[PDB]
Amino acid sequence: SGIVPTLQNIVATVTLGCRLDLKTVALHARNAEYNPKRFAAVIMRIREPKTTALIFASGKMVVTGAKSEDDSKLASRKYARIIQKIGFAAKFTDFKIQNIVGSCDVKFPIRLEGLAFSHGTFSSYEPELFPGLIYRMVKPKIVLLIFVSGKIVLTGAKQREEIYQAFEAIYPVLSEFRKMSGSPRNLHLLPTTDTYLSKVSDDPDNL
DNA sequence: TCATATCACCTGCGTTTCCGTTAAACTATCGGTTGCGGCCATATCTACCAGAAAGCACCGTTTCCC
């Protein structure tokens, strides 16, 4: 419970309001990869923040590799500004984080068979083609990947607090699977997602 | 470089289920052609009928007879 989870990847999307010519967009970006022989879209990485991004002719975009809530909106706004420099209106709309990926380490090894046998209502553990166990948390809804080393991965979340709540909910379970710190201090010590996102310009006129 | 989880996608392959196709035995009329019979025309035979010249009966004035 003392080893607070770290975010590894935040993935988001934004609507542009207007349908646009993706070939025209592909002409001016300083990083771009695109070939209709394999896929009909441009892959578009940037230096700072270190995000990858994607654009669709229908007037929608996706952003990946964000380290913070801030990076997600700030990168999306900078990609939209590049499209506004180009011959399109690109009205920044529908900003959302569809998935969050985080990880933590309890520093003790886990008997995945014991976890799967006792919590089989939520746990799945297939024959060992892959070494890690998977867990389906239903309230709040989170997917957790459990490894024998004590390393843990969390995904399927969209709100920051639920990743820390899911870790805190399974830490007592993991701690029971032991043989021969445990205090969270608070459920969420850091500021909320909204108090982070509000540092970035929200108004679409603030290009 | 293979072995899991999760999401945007969109475009693509070629899949996967009830309907459509070529053509069946058995089905429901309905048509090109078969044979079978009414109305109406004709020359002849007939039923129902009246009219004439002639019958014939009811009747009583006559007169001969009770």
Side-chain angles (χ1 to χ4, degrees), chain A residues 131-159:
Chain A
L133 175 151
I134 75 175
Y135 189 100
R136 303 299 185 158
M137 204 185 271
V138 299
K139 189 188 298 180
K141 192 190 296 305
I142 296 89
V143 183
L144 306 92
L145 263 59
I146 318 300
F147 299 94
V148 190
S149 168
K151 272 280 175 70
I152 309 294
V153 178
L154 280 58
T155 194
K158 301 93 184 176
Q159 179 64 296

PDB file of all heavy atoms in Angstrom, chain A residues 131-159:
ATOM      1  N   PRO A 131       3.265 -16.144 -18.708  1.00  0.00           N
ATOM      2  CA  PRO A 131       3.486 -16.342 -17.272  1.00  0.00           C
ATOM      3  C   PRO A 131       2.558 -15.583 -16.308  1.00  0.00           C
ATOM      4  O   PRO A 131       2.343 -16.062 -15.197  1.00  0.00           O
ATOM      5  CB  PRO A 131       4.936 -15.892 -17.056  1.00  0.00           C
ATOM      6  CG  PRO A 131       5.138 -14.808 -18.107  1.00  0.00           C
ATOM      7  CD  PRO A 131       4.330 -15.339 -19.286  1.00  0.00           C
ATOM      8  N   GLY A 132       2.021 -14.417 -16.680  1.00  0.00           N
ATOM      9  CA  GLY A 132       1.167 -13.611 -15.796  1.00  0.00           C
ATOM     10  C   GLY A 132      -0.318 -14.000 -15.738  1.00  0.00           C
ATOM     11  O   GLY A 132      -0.895 -14.508 -16.701  1.00  0.00           O
ATOM     12  N   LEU A 133      -0.929 -13.748 -14.579  1.00  0.00           N
ATOM     13  CA  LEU A 133      -2.350 -13.943 -14.263  1.00  0.00           C
ATOM     14  C   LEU A 133      -3.130 -12.654 -14.560  1.00  0.00           C
ATOM     15  O   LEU A 133      -2.573 -11.563 -14.427  1.00  0.00           O
ATOM     16  CB  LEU A 133      -2.429 -14.346 -12.777  1.00  0.00           C
ATOM     17  CG  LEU A 133      -3.831 -14.493 -12.147  1.00  0.00           C
ATOM     18  CD1 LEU A 133      -3.775 -15.523 -11.020  1.00  0.00           C
ATOM     19  CD2 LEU A 133      -4.347 -13.206 -11.500  1.00  0.00           C
ATOM     20  N   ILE A 134      -4.416 -12.748 -14.910  1.00  0.00           N
ATOM     21  CA  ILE A 134      -5.262 -11.566 -15.151  1.00  0.00           C
ATOM     22  C   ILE A 134      -6.430 -11.551 -14.156  1.00  0.00           C
ATOM     23  O   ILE A 134      -6.962 -12.598 -13.783  1.00  0.00           O
ATOM     24  CB  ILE A 134      -5.689 -11.421 -16.628  1.00  0.00           C
ATOM     25  CG1 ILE A 134      -6.787 -12.416 -17.049  1.00  0.00           C
ATOM     26  CG2 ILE A 134      -4.459 -11.509 -17.550  1.00  0.00           C
ATOM     27  CD1 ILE A 134      -7.307 -12.191 -18.474  1.00  0.00           C
ATOM     28  N   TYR A 135      -6.843 -10.362 -13.728  1.00  0.00           N
ATOM     29  CA  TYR A 135      -7.910 -10.147 -12.756  1.00  0.00           C
ATOM     30  C   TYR A 135      -8.909  -9.098 -13.251  1.00  0.00           C
ATOM     31  O   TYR A 135      -8.520  -8.006 -13.672  1.00  0.00           O
ATOM     32  CB  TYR A 135      -7.263  -9.737 -11.431  1.00  0.00           C
ATOM     33  CG  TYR A 135      -8.207  -9.685 -10.248  1.00  0.00           C
ATOM     34  CD1 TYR A 135      -8.243 -10.763  -9.341  1.00  0.00           C
ATOM     35  CD2 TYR A 135      -9.018  -8.555 -10.032  1.00  0.00           C
ATOM     36  CE1 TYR A 135      -9.065 -10.700  -8.200  1.00  0.00           C
ATOM     37  CE2 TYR A 135      -9.846  -8.491  -8.895  1.00  0.00           C
ATOM     38  CZ  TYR A 135      -9.862  -9.556  -7.971  1.00  0.00           C
ATOM     39  OH  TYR A 135     -10.636  -9.466  -6.857  1.00  0.00           O
ATOM     40  N   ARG A 136     -10.203  -9.417 -13.175  1.00  0.00           N
ATOM     41  CA  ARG A 136     -11.318  -8.568 -13.614  1.00  0.00           C
ATOM     42  C   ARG A 136     -12.046  -7.920 -12.429  1.00  0.00           C
ATOM     43  O   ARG A 136     -13.006  -8.478 -11.903  1.00  0.00           O
ATOM     44  CB  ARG A 136     -12.281  -9.420 -14.470  1.00  0.00           C
ATOM     45  CG  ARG A 136     -11.633 -10.087 -15.695  1.00  0.00           C
ATOM     46  CD  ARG A 136     -11.052  -9.060 -16.668  1.00  0.00           C
ATOM     47  NE  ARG A 136     -10.543  -9.708 -17.890  1.00  0.00           N
ATOM     48  CZ  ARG A 136     -10.368  -9.123 -19.059  1.00  0.00           C
ATOM     49  NH1 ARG A 136     -10.672  -7.879 -19.270  1.00  0.00           N
ATOM     50  NH2 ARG A 136      -9.872  -9.760 -20.072  1.00  0.00           N
ATOM     51  N   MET A 137     -11.580  -6.755 -11.982  1.00  0.00           N
ATOM     52  CA  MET A 137     -12.231  -6.004 -10.900  1.00  0.00           C
ATOM     53  C   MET A 137     -13.528  -5.386 -11.441  1.00  0.00           C
ATOM     54  O   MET A 137     -13.488  -4.707 -12.468  1.00  0.00           O
ATOM     55  CB  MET A 137     -11.269  -4.957 -10.322  1.00  0.00           C
ATOM     56  CG  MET A 137     -11.660  -4.587  -8.891  1.00  0.00           C
ATOM     57  SD  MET A 137     -10.662  -3.247  -8.205  1.00  0.00           S
ATOM     58  CE  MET A 137      -9.335  -4.260  -7.510  1.00  0.00           C
ATOM     59  N   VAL A 138     -14.671  -5.606 -10.777  1.00  0.00           N
ATOM     60  CA  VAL A 138     -15.987  -5.132 -11.270  1.00  0.00           C
ATOM     61  C   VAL A 138     -16.518  -3.818 -10.683  1.00  0.00           C
ATOM     62  O   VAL A 138     -17.307  -3.159 -11.362  1.00  0.00           O
ATOM     63  CB  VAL A 138     -17.058  -6.237 -11.118  1.00  0.00           C
ATOM     64  CG1 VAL A 138     -16.693  -7.482 -11.936  1.00  0.00           C
ATOM     65  CG2 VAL A 138     -17.318  -6.653  -9.665  1.00  0.00           C
ATOM     66  N   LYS A 139     -16.104  -3.398  -9.478  1.00  0.00           N
ATOM     67  CA  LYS A 139     -16.583  -2.150  -8.846  1.00  0.00           C
ATOM     68  C   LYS A 139     -15.536  -1.487  -7.924  1.00  0.00           C
ATOM     69  O   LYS A 139     -15.384  -1.932  -6.781  1.00  0.00           O
ATOM     70  CB  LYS A 139     -17.897  -2.447  -8.089  1.00  0.00           C
ATOM     71  CG  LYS A 139     -18.570  -1.159  -7.579  1.00  0.00           C
ATOM     72  CD  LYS A 139     -19.774  -1.417  -6.663  1.00  0.00           C
ATOM     73  CE  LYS A 139     -20.908  -2.177  -7.358  1.00  0.00           C
ATOM     74  NZ  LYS A 139     -22.048  -2.402  -6.437  1.00  0.00           N
ATOM     75  N   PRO A 140     -14.813  -0.444  -8.381  1.00  0.00           N
ATOM     76  CA  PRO A 140     -14.844   0.128  -9.734  1.00  0.00           C
ATOM     77  C   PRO A 140     -14.294  -0.861 -10.786  1.00  0.00           C
ATOM     78  O   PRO A 140     -13.605  -1.824 -10.448  1.00  0.00           O
ATOM     79  CB  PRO A 140     -14.016   1.418  -9.643  1.00  0.00           C
ATOM     80  CG  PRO A 140     -13.063   1.166  -8.474  1.00  0.00           C
ATOM     81  CD  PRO A 140     -13.909   0.320  -7.532  1.00  0.00           C
ATOM     82  N   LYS A 141     -14.580  -0.635 -12.074  1.00  0.00           N
ATOM     83  CA  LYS A 141     -14.123  -1.512 -13.170  1.00  0.00           C
ATOM     84  C   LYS A 141     -12.645  -1.286 -13.545  1.00  0.00           C
ATOM     85  O   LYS A 141     -12.322  -0.259 -14.140  1.00  0.00           O
ATOM     86  CB  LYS A 141     -15.045  -1.335 -14.389  1.00  0.00           C
ATOM     87  CG  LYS A 141     -14.802  -2.433 -15.441  1.00  0.00           C
ATOM     88  CD  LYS A 141     -15.517  -2.136 -16.768  1.00  0.00           C
ATOM     89  CE  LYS A 141     -17.054  -2.108 -16.730  1.00  0.00           C
ATOM     90  NZ  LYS A 141     -17.653  -3.354 -16.185  1.00  0.00           N
ATOM     91  N   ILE A 142     -11.755  -2.229 -13.220  1.00  0.00           N
ATOM     92  CA  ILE A 142     -10.309  -2.193 -13.547  1.00  0.00           C
ATOM     93  C   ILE A 142      -9.814  -3.604 -13.904  1.00  0.00           C
ATOM     94  O   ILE A 142     -10.233  -4.587 -13.296  1.00  0.00           O
ATOM     95  CB  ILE A 142      -9.431  -1.619 -12.392  1.00  0.00           C
ATOM     96  CG1 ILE A 142      -9.702  -0.136 -12.051  1.00  0.00           C
ATOM     97  CG2 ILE A 142      -7.916  -1.703 -12.696  1.00  0.00           C
ATOM     98  CD1 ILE A 142     -10.805   0.043 -11.009  1.00  0.00           C
ATOM     99  N   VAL A 143      -8.902  -3.715 -14.870  1.00  0.00           N
ATOM    100  CA  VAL A 143      -8.252  -4.982 -15.234  1.00  0.00           C
ATOM    101  C   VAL A 143      -6.835  -4.929 -14.663  1.00  0.00           C
ATOM    102  O   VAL A 143      -6.116  -3.955 -14.885  1.00  0.00           O
ATOM    103  CB  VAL A 143      -8.229  -5.241 -16.749  1.00  0.00           C
ATOM    104  CG1 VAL A 143      -7.614  -6.615 -17.048  1.00  0.00           C
ATOM    105  CG2 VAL A 143      -9.640  -5.199 -17.337  1.00  0.00           C
ATOM    106  N   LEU A 144      -6.431  -5.960 -13.921  1.00  0.00           N
ATOM    107  CA  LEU A 144      -5.115  -6.035 -13.287  1.00  0.00           C
ATOM    108  C   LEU A 144      -4.356  -7.279 -13.765  1.00  0.00           C
ATOM    109  O   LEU A 144      -4.930  -8.360 -13.875  1.00  0.00           O
ATOM    110  CB  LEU A 144      -5.236  -6.008 -11.745  1.00  0.00           C
ATOM    111  CG  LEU A 144      -6.024  -4.817 -11.166  1.00  0.00           C
ATOM    112  CD1 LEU A 144      -7.516  -5.102 -10.978  1.00  0.00           C
ATOM    113  CD2 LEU A 144      -5.497  -4.427  -9.781  1.00  0.00           C
ATOM    114  N   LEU A 145      -3.068  -7.128 -14.051  1.00  0.00           N
ATOM    115  CA  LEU A 145      -2.153  -8.188 -14.474  1.00  0.00           C
ATOM    116  C   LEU A 145      -1.193  -8.424 -13.303  1.00  0.00           C
ATOM    117  O   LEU A 145      -0.525  -7.497 -12.840  1.00  0.00           O
ATOM    118  CB  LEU A 145      -1.438  -7.788 -15.780  1.00  0.00           C
ATOM    119  CG  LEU A 145      -2.078  -8.353 -17.058  1.00  0.00           C
ATOM    120  CD1 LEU A 145      -3.533  -7.926 -17.255  1.00  0.00           C
ATOM    121  CD2 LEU A 145      -1.281  -7.893 -18.275  1.00  0.00           C
ATOM    122  N   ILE A 146      -1.137  -9.668 -12.829  1.00  0.00           N
ATOM    123  CA  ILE A 146      -0.354 -10.096 -11.665  1.00  0.00           C
ATOM    124  C   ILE A 146       0.820 -10.989 -12.100  1.00  0.00           C
ATOM    125  O   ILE A 146       0.609 -11.979 -12.804  1.00  0.00           O
ATOM    126  CB  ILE A 146      -1.280 -10.819 -10.652  1.00  0.00           C
ATOM    127  CG1 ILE A 146      -2.672 -10.166 -10.441  1.00  0.00           C
ATOM    128  CG2 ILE A 146      -0.560 -11.021  -9.310  1.00  0.00           C
ATOM    129  CD1 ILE A 146      -2.678  -8.731  -9.913  1.00  0.00           C
ATOM    130  N   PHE A 147       2.043 -10.680 -11.653  1.00  0.00           N
ATOM    131  CA  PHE A 147       3.261 -11.434 -11.990  1.00  0.00           C
ATOM    132  C   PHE A 147       3.944 -12.025 -10.743  1.00  0.00           C
ATOM    133  O   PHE A 147       3.941 -11.423  -9.668  1.00  0.00           O
ATOM    134  CB  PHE A 147       4.223 -10.551 -12.802  1.00  0.00           C
ATOM    135  CG  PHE A 147       3.653 -10.079 -14.126  1.00  0.00           C
ATOM    136  CD1 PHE A 147       3.001  -8.835 -14.225  1.00  0.00           C
ATOM    137  CD2 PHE A 147       3.788 -10.885 -15.272  1.00  0.00           C
ATOM    138  CE1 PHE A 147       2.476  -8.406 -15.455  1.00  0.00           C
ATOM    139  CE2 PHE A 147       3.264 -10.455 -16.503  1.00  0.00           C
ATOM    140  CZ  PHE A 147       2.601  -9.220 -16.593  1.00  0.00           C
ATOM    141  N   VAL A 148       4.595 -13.186 -10.905  1.00  0.00           N
ATOM    142  CA  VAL A 148       5.191 -13.979  -9.804  1.00  0.00           C
ATOM    143  C   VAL A 148       6.232 -13.194  -8.993  1.00  0.00           C
ATOM    144  O   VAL A 148       6.375 -13.422  -7.802  1.00  0.00           O
ATOM    145  CB  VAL A 148       5.830 -15.283 -10.344  1.00  0.00           C
ATOM    146  CG1 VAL A 148       6.241 -16.238  -9.216  1.00  0.00           C
ATOM    147  CG2 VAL A 148       4.876 -16.053 -11.263  1.00  0.00           C
ATOM    148  N   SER A 149       6.923 -12.242  -9.624  1.00  0.00           N
ATOM    149  CA  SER A 149       7.956 -11.368  -9.037  1.00  0.00           C
ATOM    150  C   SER A 149       7.443 -10.338  -8.005  1.00  0.00           C
ATOM    151  O   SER A 149       8.205  -9.894  -7.146  1.00  0.00           O
ATOM    152  CB  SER A 149       8.625 -10.663 -10.226  1.00  0.00           C
ATOM    153  OG  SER A 149       9.471  -9.592  -9.906  1.00  0.00           O
ATOM    154  N   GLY A 150       6.158  -9.967  -8.061  1.00  0.00           N
ATOM    155  CA  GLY A 150       5.522  -8.962  -7.201  1.00  0.00           C
ATOM    156  C   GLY A 150       5.182  -7.684  -7.985  1.00  0.00           C
ATOM    157  O   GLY A 150       4.531  -6.789  -7.449  1.00  0.00           O
ATOM    158  N   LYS A 151       5.632  -7.580  -9.248  1.00  0.00           N
ATOM    159  CA  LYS A 151       5.278  -6.496 -10.177  1.00  0.00           C
ATOM    160  C   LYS A 151       3.805  -6.674 -10.569  1.00  0.00           C
ATOM    161  O   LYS A 151       3.359  -7.791 -10.836  1.00  0.00           O
ATOM    162  CB  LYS A 151       6.200  -6.504 -11.416  1.00  0.00           C
ATOM    163  CG  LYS A 151       7.482  -5.678 -11.212  1.00  0.00           C
ATOM    164  CD  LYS A 151       7.218  -4.175 -11.413  1.00  0.00           C
ATOM    165  CE  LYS A 151       8.437  -3.292 -11.103  1.00  0.00           C
ATOM    166  NZ  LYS A 151       9.525  -3.445 -12.098  1.00  0.00           N
ATOM    167  N   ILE A 152       3.067  -5.574 -10.645  1.00  0.00           N
ATOM    168  CA  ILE A 152       1.634  -5.528 -10.949  1.00  0.00           C
ATOM    169  C   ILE A 152       1.354  -4.435 -11.990  1.00  0.00           C
ATOM    170  O   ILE A 152       1.951  -3.361 -11.929  1.00  0.00           O
ATOM    171  CB  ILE A 152       0.856  -5.225  -9.647  1.00  0.00           C
ATOM    172  CG1 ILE A 152       1.187  -6.118  -8.431  1.00  0.00           C
ATOM    173  CG2 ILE A 152      -0.654  -5.206  -9.890  1.00  0.00           C
ATOM    174  CD1 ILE A 152       0.812  -7.593  -8.569  1.00  0.00           C
ATOM    175  N   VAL A 153       0.439  -4.683 -12.929  1.00  0.00           N
ATOM    176  CA  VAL A 153       0.022  -3.721 -13.970  1.00  0.00           C
ATOM    177  C   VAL A 153      -1.494  -3.526 -13.893  1.00  0.00           C
ATOM    178  O   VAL A 153      -2.221  -4.493 -13.689  1.00  0.00           O
ATOM    179  CB  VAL A 153       0.470  -4.184 -15.371  1.00  0.00           C
ATOM    180  CG1 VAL A 153       0.020  -3.242 -16.493  1.00  0.00           C
ATOM    181  CG2 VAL A 153       1.991  -4.312 -15.449  1.00  0.00           C
ATOM    182  N   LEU A 154      -1.993  -2.304 -14.093  1.00  0.00           N
ATOM    183  CA  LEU A 154      -3.416  -1.944 -14.036  1.00  0.00           C
ATOM    184  C   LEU A 154      -3.824  -1.215 -15.324  1.00  0.00           C
ATOM    185  O   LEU A 154      -3.083  -0.373 -15.833  1.00  0.00           O
ATOM    186  CB  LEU A 154      -3.697  -1.012 -12.835  1.00  0.00           C
ATOM    187  CG  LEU A 154      -3.835  -1.630 -11.434  1.00  0.00           C
ATOM    188  CD1 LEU A 154      -2.633  -2.431 -10.964  1.00  0.00           C
ATOM    189  CD2 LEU A 154      -4.056  -0.532 -10.406  1.00  0.00           C
ATOM    190  N   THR A 155      -5.022  -1.503 -15.838  1.00  0.00           N
ATOM    191  CA  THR A 155      -5.551  -0.881 -17.059  1.00  0.00           C
ATOM    192  C   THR A 155      -7.084  -0.926 -17.145  1.00  0.00           C
ATOM    193  O   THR A 155      -7.752  -1.541 -16.317  1.00  0.00           O
ATOM    194  CB  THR A 155      -4.858  -1.445 -18.311  1.00  0.00           C
ATOM    195  OG1 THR A 155      -5.142  -0.615 -19.411  1.00  0.00           O
ATOM    196  CG2 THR A 155      -5.279  -2.876 -18.652  1.00  0.00           C
ATOM    197  N   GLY A 156      -7.662  -0.229 -18.121  1.00  0.00           N
ATOM    198  CA  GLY A 156      -9.101  -0.100 -18.365  1.00  0.00           C
ATOM    199  C   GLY A 156      -9.738   1.107 -17.656  1.00  0.00           C
ATOM    200  O   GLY A 156     -10.930   1.373 -17.821  1.00  0.00           O
ATOM    201  N   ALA A 157      -8.953   1.836 -16.858  1.00  0.00           N
ATOM    202  CA  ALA A 157      -9.368   3.025 -16.121  1.00  0.00           C
ATOM    203  C   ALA A 157      -9.320   4.308 -16.972  1.00  0.00           C
ATOM    204  O   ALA A 157      -8.617   4.383 -17.978  1.00  0.00           O
ATOM    205  CB  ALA A 157      -8.459   3.170 -14.897  1.00  0.00           C
ATOM    206  N   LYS A 158     -10.030   5.345 -16.512  1.00  0.00           N
ATOM    207  CA  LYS A 158     -10.101   6.686 -17.134  1.00  0.00           C
ATOM    208  C   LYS A 158      -9.948   7.826 -16.110  1.00  0.00           C
ATOM    209  O   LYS A 158      -9.608   8.946 -16.484  1.00  0.00           O
ATOM    210  CB  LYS A 158     -11.399   6.852 -17.950  1.00  0.00           C
ATOM    211  CG  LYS A 158     -11.597   5.827 -19.084  1.00  0.00           C
ATOM    212  CD  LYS A 158     -12.417   4.596 -18.663  1.00  0.00           C
ATOM    213  CE  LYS A 158     -12.497   3.586 -19.812  1.00  0.00           C
ATOM    214  NZ  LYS A 158     -13.209   2.348 -19.399  1.00  0.00           N
ATOM    215  N   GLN A 159     -10.185   7.540 -14.826  1.00  0.00           N
ATOM    216  CA  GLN A 159     -10.042   8.450 -13.684  1.00  0.00           C
ATOM    217  C   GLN A 159      -8.843   8.010 -12.819  1.00  0.00           C
ATOM    218  O   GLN A 159      -8.700   6.827 -12.503  1.00  0.00           O
ATOM    219  CB  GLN A 159     -11.379   8.529 -12.924  1.00  0.00           C
ATOM    220  CG  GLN A 159     -11.374   9.429 -11.676  1.00  0.00           C
ATOM    221  CD  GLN A 159     -11.129  10.901 -11.981  1.00  0.00           C
ATOM    222  OE1 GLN A 159     -10.073  11.286 -12.466  1.00  0.00           O
ATOM    223  NE2 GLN A 159     -12.052  11.781 -11.678  1.00  0.00           N
TER     224      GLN A 159
END
